Write a protein that holds these residues in place. Sequence first.
Motif, PDB file in Angstrom:
ATOM      1  N   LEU A   1       0.817  -1.196   0.000  1.00  0.00           N
ATOM      2  CA  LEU A   1       0.000   0.000   0.000  1.00  0.00           C
ATOM      3  C   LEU A   1       0.858   1.256   0.000  1.00  0.00           C
ATOM      4  N   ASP A   2       0.286   2.309  -0.563  1.00  0.00           N
ATOM      5  CA  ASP A   2       0.899   3.629  -0.601  1.00  0.00           C
ATOM      6  C   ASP A   2       0.415   4.386   0.628  1.00  0.00           C
ATOM      7  N   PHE A   3       1.305   4.558   1.602  1.00  0.00           N
ATOM      8  CA  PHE A   3       0.968   5.276   2.823  1.00  0.00           C
ATOM      9  C   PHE A   3       0.891   6.759   2.506  1.00  0.00           C
ATOM     10  N   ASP A   4      -0.253   7.360   2.792  1.00  0.00           N
ATOM     11  CA  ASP A   4      -0.593   8.679   2.268  1.00  0.00           C
ATOM     12  C   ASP A   4      -1.035   9.586   3.412  1.00  0.00           C
ATOM     13  N   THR A   5      -0.136  10.451   3.886  1.00  0.00           N
ATOM     14  CA  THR A   5      -0.502  11.384   4.944  1.00  0.00           C
ATOM     15  C   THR A   5      -1.372  12.531   4.451  1.00  0.00           C
ATOM     16  N   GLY A   6      -1.728  12.545   3.169  1.00  0.00           N
ATOM     17  CA  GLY A   6      -2.667  13.502   2.631  1.00  0.00           C
ATOM     18  C   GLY A   6      -4.073  12.991   2.387  1.00  0.00           C
ATOM     19  N   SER A   7      -4.401  11.776   2.814  1.00  0.00           N
ATOM     20  CA  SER A   7      -5.771  11.292   2.721  1.00  0.00           C
ATOM     21  C   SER A   7      -6.024  10.349   3.880  1.00  0.00           C
ATOM     22  N   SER A   8      -7.267   9.873   3.989  1.00  0.00           N
ATOM     23  CA  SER A   8      -7.690   9.220   5.220  1.00  0.00           C
ATOM     24  C   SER A   8      -8.514   7.968   4.975  1.00  0.00           C
ATOM     25  N   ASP A   9      -8.368   7.347   3.805  1.00  0.00           N
ATOM     26  CA  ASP A   9      -9.037   6.101   3.480  1.00  0.00           C
ATOM     27  C   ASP A   9      -7.980   5.018   3.297  1.00  0.00           C
ATOM     28  N   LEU A  10      -8.259   3.840   3.838  1.00  0.00           N
ATOM     29  CA  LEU A  10      -7.472   2.649   3.571  1.00  0.00           C
ATOM     30  C   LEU A  10      -8.296   1.853   2.579  1.00  0.00           C
ATOM     31  N   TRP A  11      -7.880   1.862   1.315  1.00  0.00           N
ATOM     32  CA  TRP A  11      -8.623   1.172   0.276  1.00  0.00           C
ATOM     33  C   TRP A  11      -7.680   0.258  -0.484  1.00  0.00           C
ATOM     34  N   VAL A  12      -8.250  -0.825  -1.008  1.00  0.00           N
ATOM     35  CA  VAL A  12      -7.469  -1.858  -1.667  1.00  0.00           C
ATOM     36  C   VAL A  12      -8.137  -2.334  -2.949  1.00  0.00           C
ATOM     37  N   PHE A  13      -7.298  -2.720  -3.906  1.00  0.00           N
ATOM     38  CA  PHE A  13      -7.734  -3.603  -4.977  1.00  0.00           C
ATOM     39  C   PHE A  13      -8.253  -4.885  -4.350  1.00  0.00           C
ATOM     40  N   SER A  14      -9.298  -5.452  -4.939  1.00  0.00           N
ATOM     41  CA  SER A  14      -9.972  -6.562  -4.291  1.00  0.00           C
ATOM     42  C   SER A  14     -10.598  -7.489  -5.320  1.00  0.00           C
ATOM     43  N   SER A  15     -11.150  -8.586  -4.811  1.00  0.00           N
ATOM     44  CA  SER A  15     -11.914  -9.505  -5.635  1.00  0.00           C
ATOM     45  C   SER A  15     -13.177  -8.860  -6.188  1.00  0.00           C
ATOM     46  N   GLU A  16     -13.543  -7.678  -5.694  1.00  0.00           N
ATOM     47  CA  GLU A  16     -14.706  -6.941  -6.162  1.00  0.00           C
ATOM     48  C   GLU A  16     -14.358  -5.910  -7.222  1.00  0.00           C
ATOM     49  N   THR A  17     -13.076  -5.657  -7.464  1.00  0.00           N
ATOM     50  CA  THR A  17     -12.697  -4.639  -8.436  1.00  0.00           C
ATOM     51  C   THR A  17     -13.012  -5.125  -9.842  1.00  0.00           C
ATOM     52  N   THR A  18     -13.678  -4.274 -10.622  1.00  0.00           N
ATOM     53  CA  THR A  18     -13.955  -4.541 -12.027  1.00  0.00           C
ATOM     54  C   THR A  18     -12.739  -5.172 -12.691  1.00  0.00           C
ATOM     55  N   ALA A  19     -12.927  -6.348 -13.296  1.00  0.00           N
ATOM     56  CA  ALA A  19     -11.778  -7.143 -13.719  1.00  0.00           C
ATOM     57  C   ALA A  19     -10.905  -6.392 -14.720  1.00  0.00           C
ATOM     58  N   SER A  20     -11.521  -5.653 -15.643  1.00  0.00           N
ATOM     59  CA  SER A  20     -10.756  -4.920 -16.643  1.00  0.00           C
ATOM     60  C   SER A  20      -9.920  -3.799 -16.047  1.00  0.00           C
TER      61      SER A  20
END
Length: 330
Positions: free
Chosen positions: A32-51
């Motif tokens: 992950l890209d640790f980002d002191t300029g934002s406040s969401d922990l988000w990930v690519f996942s099995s739910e991400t649009t495959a394309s």
Amino acid sequence: STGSATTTPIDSLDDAYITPVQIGTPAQTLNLDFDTGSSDLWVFSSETTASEVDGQTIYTPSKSTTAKLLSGATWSISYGDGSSSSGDVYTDTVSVGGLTVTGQAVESAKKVSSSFTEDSTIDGLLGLAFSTLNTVSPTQQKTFFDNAKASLDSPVFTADLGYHAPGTYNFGFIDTTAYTGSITYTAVSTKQGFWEWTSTGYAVGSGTFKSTSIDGIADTGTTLLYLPATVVSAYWAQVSGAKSSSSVGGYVFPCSATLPSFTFGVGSARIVIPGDYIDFGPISTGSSSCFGGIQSSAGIGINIFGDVALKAAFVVFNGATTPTLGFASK
């Protein structure tokens, strides 16, 4: 408790840094890209649009025995570079460098914009700004640091980014072997949700220091140093052939140049960015025009002390009741 994790540049230019993060049970490790300029922990996942997945490692909540859907929760974020992502939310166990938070909101991407798809090395973001910026709706969620804070030995994390080399994010302690001299602390405003502070001025190369207040944010998720047009013009005026190019999107300079250093003030202290840190290489493969690492903030609305500046320092993000920032040379 404490944690300590190595952060590694994604490419030869230090365009961003990735830090391994363990999510779920059994652990799924994502970079992950640790980002002191934002406040969401988000990930690519099995739910991400495959394309929209192209080489990233994905989080699969159905394979984690500790994952729980946060029912009804959605998120959607847009970043200063025009990129964006959105999806739904799980809670799960998240560990960084040995420090574990249970019940962390893990925002699962259903959609990501093209720049995320095109960067196979970044599996998501871990926000470290203030939780007031978190985008989860209808119930805003806390950052990893906010959730960990009470358990930490000290309510701090530190960023020690490397120049063309790995560095370290520490949670809960200040490694007194990682910097030289003393740490100078400076006040923070949380009014915009950022680690926002006021630099006391700047110098270009061996030039005299100009005392002037520069309000800006300490942002590990931004590659470059974005400052007022006056300051940036003063810097590039010292580089023969440097110019602002509307077609490229900022200051460029001859790749044959030797760049001067840039100093910024932290209280009465000074952090020196070596000239080499300001070279972001050819604008396109084989070009002799090189992209500058100091750019104007005039089109942003805020000055940004991004990686170019932060990697020249050991930086303390002090999350005490009244937050402060600390900078030391290293």
